[PDB]
Structure formats: structure tokens, C-alpha cells
Amino acid sequence: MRMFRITACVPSQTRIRTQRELQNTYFTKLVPYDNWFREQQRIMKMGGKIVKVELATGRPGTNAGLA
Amino acid sequence: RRFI
Amino acid sequence: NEVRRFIPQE
Amino acid sequence: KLTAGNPMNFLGMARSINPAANTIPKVSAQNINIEASVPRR
Amino acid sequence: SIVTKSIVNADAEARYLSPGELDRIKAFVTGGAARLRIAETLTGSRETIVKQAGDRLFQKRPDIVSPGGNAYGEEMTATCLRDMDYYLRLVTYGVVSGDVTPIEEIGLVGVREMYRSLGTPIEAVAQSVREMKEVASGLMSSDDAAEASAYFDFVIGKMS
Amino acid sequence: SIVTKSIVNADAEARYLSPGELDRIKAFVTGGAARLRIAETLTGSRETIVKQAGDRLFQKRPDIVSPGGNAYGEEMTATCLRDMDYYLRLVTYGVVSGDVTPIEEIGLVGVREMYRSLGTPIEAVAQSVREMKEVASGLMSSDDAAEASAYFDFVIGKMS
Amino acid sequence: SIVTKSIVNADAEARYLSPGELDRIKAFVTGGAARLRIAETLTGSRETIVKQAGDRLFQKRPDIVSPGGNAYGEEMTATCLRDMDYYLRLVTYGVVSGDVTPIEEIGLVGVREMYRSLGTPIEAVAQSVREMKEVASGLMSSDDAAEASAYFDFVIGKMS
Amino acid sequence: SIVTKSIVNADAEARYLSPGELDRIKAFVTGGAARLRIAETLTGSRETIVKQAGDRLFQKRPDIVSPGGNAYGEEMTATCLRDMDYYLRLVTYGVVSGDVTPIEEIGLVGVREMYRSLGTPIEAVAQSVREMKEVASGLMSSDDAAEASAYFDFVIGKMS
Amino acid sequence: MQDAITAVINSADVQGKYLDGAAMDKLKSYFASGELRVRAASVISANAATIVKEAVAKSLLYSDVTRPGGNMYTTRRYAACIRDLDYYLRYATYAMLAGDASILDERVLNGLKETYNSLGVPISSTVQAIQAIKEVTASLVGADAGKEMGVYLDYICSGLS
Amino acid sequence: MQDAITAVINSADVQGKYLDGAAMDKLKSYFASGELRVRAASVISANAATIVKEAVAKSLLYSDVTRPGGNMYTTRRYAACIRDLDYYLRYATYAMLAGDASILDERVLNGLKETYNSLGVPISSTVQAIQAIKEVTASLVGADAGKEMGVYLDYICSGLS
Amino acid sequence: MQDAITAVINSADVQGKYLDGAAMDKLKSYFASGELRVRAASVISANAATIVKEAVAKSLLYSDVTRPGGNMYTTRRYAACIRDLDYYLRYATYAMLAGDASILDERVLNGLKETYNSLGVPISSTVQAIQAIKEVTASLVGADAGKEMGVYLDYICSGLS
Amino acid sequence: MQDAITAVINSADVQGKYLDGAAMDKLKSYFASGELRVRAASVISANAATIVKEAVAKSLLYSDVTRPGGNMYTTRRYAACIRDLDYYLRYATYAMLAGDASILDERVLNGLKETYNSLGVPISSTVQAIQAIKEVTASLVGADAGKEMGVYLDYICSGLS
Amino acid sequence: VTPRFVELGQVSAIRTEPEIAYRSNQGVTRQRQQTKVFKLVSTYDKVAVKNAIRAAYRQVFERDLEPYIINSEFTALESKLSNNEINVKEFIEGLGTSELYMKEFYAPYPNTKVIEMGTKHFLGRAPLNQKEIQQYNQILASQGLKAFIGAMVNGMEYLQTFGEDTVPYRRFPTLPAANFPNTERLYNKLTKQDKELVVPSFTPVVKVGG
């Protein structure tokens, strides 16, 4: 399957958390192609900044053979 | 097509 | 050296 | 009588095969030099 | 069976069976009598298959029937041969069903826990399946033997 | 309804209704008679609103009332006008309630599934509602037409 | 404002604003003139609002301006008046936007943590805002004061 | 209790308690006798701890016992001592347990909501516990007081 | 959920009928009551915390429920009890505004008995507390609005009993 | 779910015995009907939407079920009934291919009556739509295949009453 | 996201000053344009699918983009393209209603340019399709509202470069 | 759940009592027993697998339970069974450390009798296997600790029947 | 005389052990407090990573996987999480879209029960209302199991509750009505305890259109 590798910085808005939060604040993750639109919308609504997007897996322009 |  | 059996224990 | 899966049903087969156990080996950790005998591929 | 394997796969996608899935069900039912013959061969020759496999196993793994070994002694050897007959009976379930579902759900799911608790060396159980495969593949034509081998090999691969 | 809509918005936040919401409710109840008059107008001229709008639709989309069209034949044509009657009645529900949820819950959730199952061209349904909006608008003053138009446009915007 | 709240609500359902939400927006912009009047009143009287509020608070709470009090001394008491001015400025922001959101985001999220760190008795801050509300409500009509009360109360409520 | 916490942690990871956990429980039970003595000290002097603390509290917060105050009058004053008695009793639970869990579970989760509903100045409740800590410290050795103060300090922090 | 207006609409819809004169009479009756409902709702919301405080004082405090071993004992349970009373008052205010109790059957009573019976919450004591809330709010909003709020608080109590 | 082959294999494994002659004949019987089932499943999947559409047209349309007050009335409830019929045909096709109704017991009928009773879905109307699914399906898969499909569409109907 | 009011608030707050005469003017201007924005928003929502239909027919159909080898070839990618345009118009409508493009920075131009460059979506063709949306909308909402919608649709276009 | 200490604390709190002499005695008794509890617990964990292995060997091997038609037949069921025995040993050790069986009522026995009757797990055989676990553990931890584990393993056995 | 403040804290009448046991365990279960939340704050500690993983299996599948797998199919998924290439949320969704999950909690049950077991495992609660049951029934009817799991774990509620770094866990929701008792009934049953629907559907108060 095609996959994106995305970097995002998601701040905290309505609370001052006391545990360590760096892991869920600035992170890089693999997102399946079929989840990126939804996932990108969710991060945007949570105030997150999408800092980097890459097509980690797959090729641009494929018509057949997406797995 | 009839509904009766 | 032990020899294990195949009978149910009573 | 013996039911299916009962190991008794294979006792006759086991005796027929009469497998040969290895002889009680002659080994002694005392006589083994560990650092010298461990392979070094 | 191959039928349940396909149905479960299509149901998880909320869809009817694909043309390919129907194709292999059609082929499976068409070649049914060949599978029932292979299954008929193994059942009839089970006693010689297990014994000759049991004999071959202990000559490659004499330790397991030596003092301290899991199959040490005649009574444990009888239990070990029983286990070979179990897995022989399951290979014949696989062939007739065209799918390894009967094998997995009866003899492989959780098997590592069972043999770990009993102390049986699992790689030696796999070896006994090889031996049964060889004794079996010489009792039938290559085409029939080849079909039977695929199911023996599945067990050998999963146990190893 | 405007009252239900604001209550569910307030409950979703586990809060009492805000002054802004309470003022909107106060205005709606105090302008109540004006809305009911518009609904009375639509209700009383429902025969002519549907007939004229239906007459215009088939002129605008003659294919739907041609061989192979979903509304071909007098009987299918009757069901199409019935459907238009359904949607007009819903518009009057929206007018008196000051909210579209009565329209949505009755005749827009799953509308695409329903009409694709029936084979009806949904965009032509959007056209039929559009036609009813002109006929209705021409039976009332501009300010009244604007109040009803909002609900006509909501139905049109959802099916289309 | 109610514009952002409506859009955020509409964007959660990936939909356009419904007619009811648009009507609420239209009412909100019409009442804008009244909102601006109140905010101008508070802004024009801010110096007197804070000064009188401070006097009222200190009479009620001599401990805070006594030795050992957080606001003790001219330098600290001036800083305390500055905070009262901050929250008056925030209440003005809430007035023009018709919502408490600017107040929450600038001055009420983590407010307890900050003042606890500074050793400021939060209940005395809550009291100061009550004093400003009293003085401010005396400079405008009953309706205007009632309008502005929601924002004064919101600050008090979040400081308990 | 460290014993409950360890089992909770161990079962959440579906494992036996680690050697480090068992060592902590061992040290916990060995130090039980010293914990019990401190509990006996506080339990023995219960009535004088509360009475002297209440008198100290009213000396520095006379408003709460003067007319109009939350604790004004004999009955309300006794209720205030009753509440102080509650928290002293919870402190003994924590001392014996070696942990604040009995204190938090019984008398601190939502304490702010409770006293706000009753109109009790919470900062005065925190003062009363401070008063009980000072009194109790003068009934036990310096080491014993330092151990007991962690539980008093836990209550005070949660009331601020 | 259904309010007074959608109750009229739903009764017409199930018969597939436009709203006739009688239906418009019902809508007019509710529109005429709108001002009373709105004013009462704003007074209740501005006094919600104090309404519950006085209801608790006269109905729950200094009894078995607040003494140790009692269901309201411990700060968490006391706080939960106040929160529950806040909910009942807030949903009654929704119902009073809507002029329809269906919200109570849907968003309050659904599974409530099962919840309280599993937790050991005293049903009689919560009913007495809600009745105290009914008395207190009536003395705040007047007899007419007090009796209207009484319908929907009494509706909750009858649901729990 | 178990198919016909699985039932034979499980009937022997529970006894711990190899497949004897009688078991081989049960496998042979199923192997004989493999083309009949596969062919029917091919056409059904090709015409699934059409079978439901015409089953509904012949069974539920232009009745009180779809008119105001009927359970299919409103576009939301129309779609829900269509979705349910899609379920019953797809799962009846599974059962037909497997020669066994276990999948209907597990994935369809378990708790279905509880669901419908809570939502007010009319059972008798649902049975008519399924019986109409059967008659439409039979006219398309031939008579022999439609007989086997009828067994499993009847099984759902039986499990619903 | 911030609307025109919250933008003016934020400008004063960052400097810690009250709303002065110039800031009040900006608030007044936004209030006076409110009816026109809500009018245009109502028009766009009624014709939103039609707007995208005609913008696509005008800028993308029957071209290399939709023929084999074009990025919009395949129904899969055609639908993905139609979705993007549908989201562009709706978010441009939010921005017009709010009178501020911040929502476009946060919920449109936040990772979108880098996603498009990863998949090989042609920005040039995307900008032309958006421009066609701007032309189609102006024919529906007039010139004063169409110019305002064009401001924010242009913001998206330049955001994608 | 509760351990020996919190049981005393909670029962005191229910009665609104400071820890009296009898409570202090119970606390002292648990503290004195603490050292032997941690020792037994450390022993059991080091031998957990061997304990269950021996218990199965002496209670559930070479019987009809492990043969075809027996509830332990098939590898997945054999694994599930010895997994269950591992549950009882571990939770019985938790209870031993806590000096309180409540964790067993809460995290072991809740729904267990129902679950076994649903799946056809033979409870008689299960209690035999637990009894065998009791004998094997006692041999490893000692007589005093063996009895303590015996209490809690018996508690599980009595909760099954 | 006995000090008044002492009398004001006294328990009327003597309390027997039954009353004491009942009063000691009244209210919400102590399991709400007596639990652990596995929040993977770092990937340097492989023991913590493995502990989070095994908790994930227990949450989603309701117990350890060993007795119903032949070999592990999640090894590459664990490798990705351990290498910080994915987050706990992606690992959790990877479990829900696995063949093992399909076998355990989709194939044995109707889609109605799949819904409530889904929300239990991935959201920690019973389904909220009929709208939620409708929403997931359409997803199952049209796209299948993987779409349903993806909807739950990628929704706003999941991220607000469990976020990206935390294994889901049992919740004790107060609102909305019936969510607490329904969630309680779901979590007070052992795995395969029965084949019954806790929440087949919410009985409507007002039938729109009927």
C-alpha cells in the first residue's frame, strides 16, 4: 500500500499537562494513504501544524497495482 | 411501470 | 533417570 | 476398550520400533576448557 | 474449508465472493475425487506411515528416546507415535477440505504453548512430520504425492 | 425546531442555553404568527404549487417522462408528483419550526440510497423542488418568499 | 465570536452552515452596534472602574495589602490594579465578540496555576472582578449592564 | 497501600510482582510498627488536636465564627471541628497505610466542589489543617512529626 | 428529542398531512408561552448553583447519607451527588423550554434506574432532593413558571420511582 | 461458521478418527453440488441490487409500509430496510455456497429479534420482503439453485418469527 | 481559526490595549457586511455541487488531465479531485463568512502543498480549477459577494503556489 | 480490590472510627506475616510454569479430558486450559500477598461460572487441577505458606462450584 | 459531656459486617482508580515498549494472544512501534484491522454486536446512541470491518481521550444517559461469556415518521 511519512507539531490548547508530552506533540509517523486525508483533517482541527509530508511508500501516478 |  | 508413564495418575 | 487417541494404542508400535537410546555419554564439565573449545568461526 | 476461508474473507469486506474465489471453489469441487483418493491412501497406510516415520525420527534424534529425553522409554515413545497419528489424521482433513483450516484449528493454534508445557522439543515434532511425508509420498503417484506433500509441508513450516 | 436545535447545541456543551440562543428563541416565538401565515399560504396552494412545478419539470426534463425515463407513464408520473408533494409539505414543516431538522430527519437522510435503489435521477428531484420554489415564490411577497426560500434551498442543496 | 463557533460546528460535520445558523449570524451582526456601545462605555470609564474596584476590594481584603500580603506596598498594589485592568480589557473583548472565548484563551486557561505560583490568593482576584462588575454596572443602563454581566461573571466563575 | 499499588501494577502487566516490588513490600511491613506508633499518638490526642487547632483557627480567621460566617454559632462551629476531625482521622489512615491514597479517596476528590456548594471558605479549611499539623507536631518527636507532616501537607496542598 | 413544535409536526407527518387550523392553534399556544419559558430559563441558569445548594441543605444534609458509611459521604460522592442534581435541574430547564418531556425519557431516564441500583444510590433520597429543587425553583420563578418546571422535575422523579 | 465439509471433518475429529466411507460419501455429495452453488452465487452477486430492488418493488412499495406512518416511511428508514435486505441476500448466498446455515445463526440471527423489537421493525413485513427476495432470486438462478437458496432465505424468515 | 472580530481583538491584545476608534471602525465595517456574506453563503450552499460540476467541466474535462496519463484519469482519481474542489469551495465560504483567511491557513494550507507534490497532483491544473470555481461562483452570488469569494479562493490558489 | 491494610481502614471509615485496639492488632498481624508472604510470592513466580506443568501432569493428562471428545482436546483448548491454570496461580498469589481474597471476587470469579457453563469447560476437572496446583505449590513454598495459598486456591475452587 | 463535634461525626447505631461490607464497596467500582494507563512516553526503554505492546493486545483482544495464535502476525507492527515509525494509535488500529481481530470479534458475531465490542475495545465504552449505531452499521454494511476500526480510532473522541501515545482502556463515562450502565455491562463480562447483545439498539422515544 502507499503510505505517507508525515511530521506534525500538535500544541496543547485547553490544558496544562504535567506528564511528558513531547512524544505526542512533535512526531513523525507513517500513515496509510487511505487514512491521510482524514488524519490530516483531524490534526488541522486539533490545531496541529503539518510540517512535512512525504510519500514514503508507493509511486506517484500509479493506476493499477496499489496493493 | 404500474403501482396498481 | 525417570521414566514417564502414559497412564492417568490415581 | 481403548478409545481413539489413547497412547496405549501405540504401545505395540513403540515396542516393535524398539528405538535405541544413546549410551550414557562420557562428558565432564571439569575436563572442558570453555574458552579454548568454543568454536571461533 | 476453501469455502469457509473465502466466505470469511469476503464477509470481512462486506462483499460477495470475487470471480477468483468462485474459481478456486469450482476447481476444488471438480478435483474432489482426487483429494478423496489421496485422503483414502493416507488413512489406509497410516500404521505403516507412522511406524516407518517413527523409526526414521528416532534414528535422526536418538536423544529424545535417551535418558532425559522427552520420548524416553517405551511408554513415552508410544505417546510420541500417538502424536504423529494425530497430525497424520489432520493432514487428511486438510486435503479433503482444500484448506489448512482443519489443521490450524485442531493441531497448530496454541500448539507451542502445549508442547512448551510438556517439554516436548517442537523442532523434533516437525521432523516426525517430514518422516511421515516421505513414507507417504512413496505410496502414491507424484501428482497425488505432491498434493499430499503441500499439507505435510504446511505443518512443518508452522511448527518450525 | 429552533428550540430543539439550540437545546441539543447546549446539551452537547453540558451548559444552559446562552443569552444569544435564548434571544433567538424569543424572537422566533414573537414572530410566530408571520411564519404560520407563510405555511398557511403554502398549504392552501399546494395543489397548484405541485401541479405547475411538475408541469414545468417535465418541460425542463422531458427525458424523465419519455420511454426509459423513471417517470414515464401516468402512474409513474403520479408518484413523481406525490414525491414533490412530500417535499413541499416538509418545506412547510421547516417554515413553522424555524429549523431544517424536521426536513432532514424525514426526507433527506438516506435520500441518495432511496432514489438510487428506485433508479430515480436525484438531480431531477432537485430540479422539481427548484420548480416548486419559483411557483411558491410567485404566490407571496418577496420577504415571505425569502423566508420560505431558505428551506427550499436547503432541500435543493442536499439532494443536489 | 458566534461566527467562528458556527463555522467550527459546521466544519465538524463537513457541511455548510444551515439556515438557522446563518439567521443567528445575521442577528449577531445587527446587534453589533449595541455591543460596541457597551465596550466603548467600559473603555472610557476603565480608569475609574479599576480605581474604585481596587478601593472596594482592599476594604474587603485588608490582608492582601497588609504586611505579608501579596499586593503589599505601592509597587505590588499597583501591579494588582494592573491585573484588574487586564481583566477589564478582556471583558471588553468578550463584549464586542459576543462570546467569552477571548477571555478564556487570554486570561482564564491556567490562571490558577499562574497565581498560585505568584502566591496570589485567587479568591481575592475573583473578588476584585466582582468589585469591577459592581462599579461598571453603575455607569450604563440596566440592559447594557445585564449584557456585560455575563462576561464579568464568567471571569468570576472560572476563579470560583 | 504499596501492597495494593504493586498488585495493581503487576496485574495490569499480567505478571508476578518483580523482586524489586517484593523488596519494597518487605521494607513496608518491617516499618509498620513505627507507622502504627505515630497513628496511636495522633489517635490518642484526637480531641485535644482538634480543639486546640479550632481555637487557633478562629484566632486568625475570626470572620468565619462571627455572625454571618460559615461557622458562626455553636452548631456550625462544631461542624467545622467535625470536619477537622474527619481530616485528622484520614491522616491516621494514611500514616498507617504509609500512603496518601486513603486520604485522597475519602476526603479530597472533589473537595473543592463540596465546600464551594456549602459556601465554606476552602482556604480556611486548609488553614485548619495547617493548625492541626502544628499542634500534632508538638506531641511527637521531630522524626515522627516529619513523617506525619507529609500527610498533613498532602491535605493542605489539595485545599489550595 | 421532540419539543412542542415538533410534536405538532410529527403528529401531522405520521398521517402525511399538512398543518391544518387546529395544528396552527397548538403552535400559537406554545408561541404565546415562549416569553414565560425564556424568562424562567434565564433566571434558573443564573441561580442553578444556589438552587441546588438550598435543595441539598433542606433535603440531604445532616442525615444518614452524609455520615460516614453513607452514599453521599466522601468528597467524591458528595461532589457526584451535587453534579447529578445539577444535571436534573439543567435537563428540566431544557424540557421546560421545549415544552416536552421526551428529552427526559431520552437523555436522563434512559438506564438511570439501572445505574443507581448498581451503585447503591438511594432512590428515595434523590427523589426527595429533586422535590426540594422543585420547591426552591418555584419560589424563584413564580407559581406559573414554578408549576411548569414542576411538571418536568416531577417527570424525572416519576421516572426514578 | 461451518460449511458442509467442516461438519464432516468435525464429526470425525470429535471422535478422533480418520474419514471412513460414510464421511467420504457426504463429501462426495457436497462435491457434486459445487458447480450448482458456484453458478448461483455468480449470478446472485451480479444482480444483487436488482434482486433487492425488484423484491422491494413487488413486496413493500405502494403499501402502508412505505406510506406516512409505515416503518419504511422517511428516506432514512427506506435506506435501512434496503440495507437489511442486502444483508439477507449476501448472507443467504454465503449459506448456499457453504451448504450450511451456521453463518446465518452466528452473523445474522443472533440478537436480530431483540434489535428489531427495540426499533419497532415489523417482522411480518420483513418476512414478506425476504420471501419476495426468494421468488425473485429463484426466477434468476433457475429452479434447482433457487430451491437451495430458498432453504436459507426460509431459515432467516424462520429465525425471525 | 479567527474571524474578522477575533482578528481585531488579537491585534489589540498582543499590544495589551483596549479597542480604540480605528479598531471599532473595523468591527463596524464587518458588522455592516454581515447580511451580504450570509446571503452569499446561502447561495453557495444551495449550488455547491453544481458549482463544482460546472467548474470541472470548464477547466478539467476533455483535456490531457482527464485522458489516460492525466492525473485525473481513473474514476478513483477523478473522485479524489472532485472531493478536493468540494472542500476548497466550502472552506472559501467559511473564510468569506468569517471575513478572515486564517481558517484557510489552518484547515486548507496546512500540509496540502506537500501532499500534492508527493502524489504528483498538478498544482497548475488545480489552480485553474479553483479559478474556474471563482468564475462560476461570481455568476451566482453577484459581483460584490463574488469578489469577496474570489479573494479567499485566490488565497488558496497562491497558497498552493 | 483491597489488601489487609485497606480492608481495616475502609471498615473503620465506614463506621467513622479511628483505628482502635482491635484494628491495630489486625494491622500488626499482617505486618508480622509480611515477610513470609513476600518469600512465598518470590518462590511461586520462579516456579509458576513448573507448578502448572506438574499439576496438569498429575490431574489432567492421559485421561478422557485430553483425548478426542474431551474438553482439553485440540491444541488451542489445551493452551487455553493451562492459560487458565496460570491465571489461578497468579491471582491466588496476589491474594496471598494482599492477605485478602477480594481481588479474586473482582478479577477472577466475576462471571467465571457462567463463562465455563457457556463453553462447556468441565468445572469438576478444573477444580481438580486447581487442587493439584495447591499440592504442588505447598511442596515448594513450605507448610505455612502452602496453607496460605491453599486458602485462596480453595476460594477459587469454591467460587467455581 | 461528649464534645459536640464528635457527635456530629458519629455513625448512628452499631454496624454489622454485612452493612460494613456493603457500605465499603458502594458506588463506582474501585477499578476506576485501581488500574494502570499505559502511556508510551519514550521508545528508548524496550521493556516499557514491550509492556505497552502486551497491554495493547490485552485491551483489544481482551487477553494475551499466545493460546490462540500459531505464530505471531504482529512482529513487524511491534518493530515499527518500537522503532518510533508509528505511534500507539497506529499500533492499536493495526491490531483492529488484523486477521486475528477479524477472527475473534467479527466472524463469530453479527455486525450489531461487532459495533459494541468495537467501541468497547477501541473507545473503552458502549455505543453512545442510535446515531452512532447507525453510523457504524452503514460502515460495516458497505466497507467491512477495517473501515469500522479506522473510523473509531481516527475519530476526534479517540484522540481527545487516548491520544496518539496511550493504549485505550476501560472508561467510566458519566454522560450521556445509559452510557455508564451499558459500558459497565460490557466490561463485567468475561470473554465469550455469552452470545448476547448488551446494546442491540436504543429504543426510540419519538419515532420520526411513525
Ligand SMILES: *[C@H](C)[C@H]1/C(=C/c2[nH]c(/C=C3N=C(/C=C4\NC(=O)C(CC)=C4C)C(C)=C\3CCC(=O)O)c(CCC(=O)O)c2C)NC(=O)[C@@H]1C
Ligand atoms: C518558560 C521558561 C518559557 C516558555 C515556555 C513555554 N512552553 C510551551 C509549550 C511547551 N513546552 C513543552 C516542553 C516540554 N514538554 C515535555 O514533555 C518536556 C520533556 C519532559 C518538555 C521540555 C512542550 C512539548 C510544549 C507544547 C505542548 C504543551 O504545552 O503541552 C509554551 C506554550 C506554547 C504555545 O504557544 O502554546 C510556553 C509559553 N515560554 C517563554 O516565553 C519562556 C521563556
Ligand SMILES: *[C@H](C)[C@H]1/C(=C/c2[nH]c(/C=C3N=C(/C=C4\NC(=O)C(CC)=C4C)C(C)=C\3CCC(=O)O)c(CCC(=O)O)c2C)NC(=O)[C@@H]1C
Ligand atoms: C419526481 C420529481 C421524480 C420521481 C419520483 C418517483 N418516486 C418514486 C417512488 C418513491 N418515492 C418515494 C419517496 C419517499 N418516501 C418517503 O418516506 C419520503 C418522505 C420524505 C419520500 C420522499 C418512495 C418511498 C417511493 C416508492 C414507492 C412508494 O411510495 O411506495 C417513483 C416510482 C419509481 C418506481 O419504479 O416505482 C418515482 C417515479 N421520478 C422522476 O423521474 C422524478 C425526478
Ligand SMILES: *[C@H](C)[C@H]1/C(=C/c2[nH]c(/C=C3N=C(/C=C4\NC(=O)C(CC)=C4C)C(C)=C\3CCC(=O)O)c(CCC(=O)O)c2C)NC(=O)[C@@H]1C
Ligand atoms: C472548619 C475548618 C470549616 C467549616 C466547616 C463546615 N463544614 C460544614 C458542613 C459539612 N462538611 C462536610 C464535610 C465532609 N464530608 C465528607 O464526606 C468529608 C470527608 C470525610 C468531609 C470533609 C459535609 C458533608 C457537610 C454538610 C453537613 C453534613 O455533614 O451533613 C459546615 C456547615 C455548613 C452549613 O451551612 O451547614 C461547616 C461550618 N466551616 C468554616 O468556615 C471552616 C473553614
Ligand SMILES: *[C@H](C)[C@H]1/C(=C/c2[nH]c(/C=C3N=C(/C=C4\NC(=O)C(CC)=C4C)C(C)=C\3CCC(=O)O)c(CCC(=O)O)c2C)NC(=O)[C@@H]1C
Ligand atoms: C444525589 C442527590 C444522590 C447521589 C448521587 C450520586 N451519583 C453517583 C454516580 C453517578 N450518577 C450518575 C448519573 C447520571 N449520568 C448521566 O449521564 C445522567 C443523565 C443526565 C445521570 C443522572 C452516573 C452515571 C453515575 C456513575 C458514574 C459517575 O459517578 O461518574 C454517585 C456515586 C459516585 C461515585 O464516584 O461513587 C453518587 C453519590 N448519592 C446520594 O446519596 C444522593 C441521594
Ligand SMILES: *[C@H](C)[C@H]1/C(=C/c2[nH]c(/C=C3N=C(/C=C4\NC(=O)C(CC)=C4C)C(C)=C\3CCC(=O)O)c(CCC(=O)O)c2C)NC(=O)[C@@H]1C
Ligand atoms: C426491511 C425489509 C424492513 C425494515 C428494516 C429496517 N431496519 C432498520 C434498522 C436496523 N436493521 C439492522 C439490522 C441488522 N444488523 C446486523 O448486524 C444484521 C445482520 C446482518 C442485521 C439484519 C440494525 C442493526 C438496525 C439499526 C441500525 C440502522 O438503522 O442502521 C430500520 C430502521 C429503524 C429505525 O427507525 O431506526 C428499518 C426501517 N423496516 C421495514 O419496515 C421493513 C419490513
Ligand SMILES: *[C@H](C)[C@H]1/C(=C/c2[nH]c(/C=C3N=C(/C=C4\NC(=O)C(CC)=C4C)C(C)=C\3CCC(=O)O)c(CCC(=O)O)c2C)NC(=O)[C@@H]1C
Ligand atoms: C454511456 C454508457 C453512459 C454515458 C456516458 C458519459 N460519460 C461522460 C463523461 C465522462 N465519463 C468519464 C469516465 C471515465 N474516465 C475515466 O478515467 C474512467 C476509467 C477509465 C471512466 C469510466 C469521464 C472522465 C467523463 C468526463 C469527460 C472527460 O472525458 O473529461 C459523458 C459526457 C457528460 C457531459 O456532459 O460531458 C457521457 C454522456 N452517459 C449516459 O447517459 C450513458 C448511461
Ligand SMILES: *[C@H](C)[C@H]1/C(=C/c2[nH]c(/C=C3N=C(/C=C4\NC(=O)C(CC)=C4C)C(C)=C\3CCC(=O)O)c(CCC(=O)O)c2C)NC(=O)[C@@H]1C
Ligand atoms: C483536482 C482539482 C486535482 C487533483 C486532485 C487529487 N488529489 C488527490 C489526493 C489528495 N488530495 C488531498 C487534499 C487535501 N487534504 C486536506 O486536508 C485538504 C484540505 C481540505 C485538501 C484539499 C489529499 C490529502 C490527498 C491524498 C489522500 C486522499 O486522496 O485521500 C488525488 C489522488 C492522487 C492519487 O495518486 O491517488 C487527486 C487526483 N488531481 C488533478 O489532476 C486535479 C488538477
Ligand SMILES: *[C@H](C)[C@H]1/C(=C/c2[nH]c(/C=C3N=C(/C=C4\NC(=O)C(CC)=C4C)C(C)=C\3CCC(=O)O)c(CCC(=O)O)c2C)NC(=O)[C@@H]1C
Ligand atoms: C513425537 C514426534 C514427539 C513427542 C511427543 C509427545 N507428546 C506428549 C504428550 C502430549 N502430546 C499431546 C498432543 C496433542 N493433543 C492434541 O489434542 C493435539 C492435536 C489433536 C496434539 C498434537 C498431548 C495433549 C499430550 C499430553 C498427554 C495426553 O495425551 O494426555 C508426550 C509425553 C509428554 C510427557 O512427558 O507426558 C510426548 C513424548 N515427544 C518427542 O520427544 C517427539 C519429538
Ligand SMILES: *[C@H](C)[C@H]1/C(=C/c2[nH]c(/C=C3N=C(/C=C4\NC(=O)C(CC)=C4C)C(C)=C\3CCC(=O)O)c(CCC(=O)O)c2C)NC(=O)[C@@H]1C
Ligand atoms: C483447564 C484446567 C480446563 C479448561 C479450560 C479452558 N478454558 C477455556 C476458555 C476460557 N477460560 C476463561 C477464563 C478466564 N478468563 C479470564 O480472564 C479469567 C479471569 C482472570 C478467567 C478465569 C475464559 C474467559 C475463556 C474464554 C476466552 C478465552 O479463552 O480467552 C477453554 C476453551 C474453551 C473453548 O471452547 O475454546 C478451555 C479448554 N478446559 C478443561 O477441559 C480443563 C478442565
Ligand SMILES: *[C@H](C)[C@H]1/C(=C/c2[nH]c(/C=C3N=C(/C=C4\NC(=O)C(CC)=C4C)C(C)=C\3CCC(=O)O)c(CCC(=O)O)c2C)NC(=O)[C@@H]1C
Ligand atoms: C541481522 C542479520 C543483523 C542485525 C539486525 C538488527 N536489526 C535491529 C532492529 C531493527 N530491524 C528492523 C527491520 C525491520 N522491521 C520491519 O518491520 C521490517 C519490514 C518487514 C524490517 C526489515 C527494525 C525496524 C528495527 C528497529 C526496531 C526493532 O527493534 O524491531 C536490531 C536491534 C537494534 C537495537 O539495538 O535496537 C538488530 C540487532 N544486527 C546485526 O548485527 C546483524 C548483521
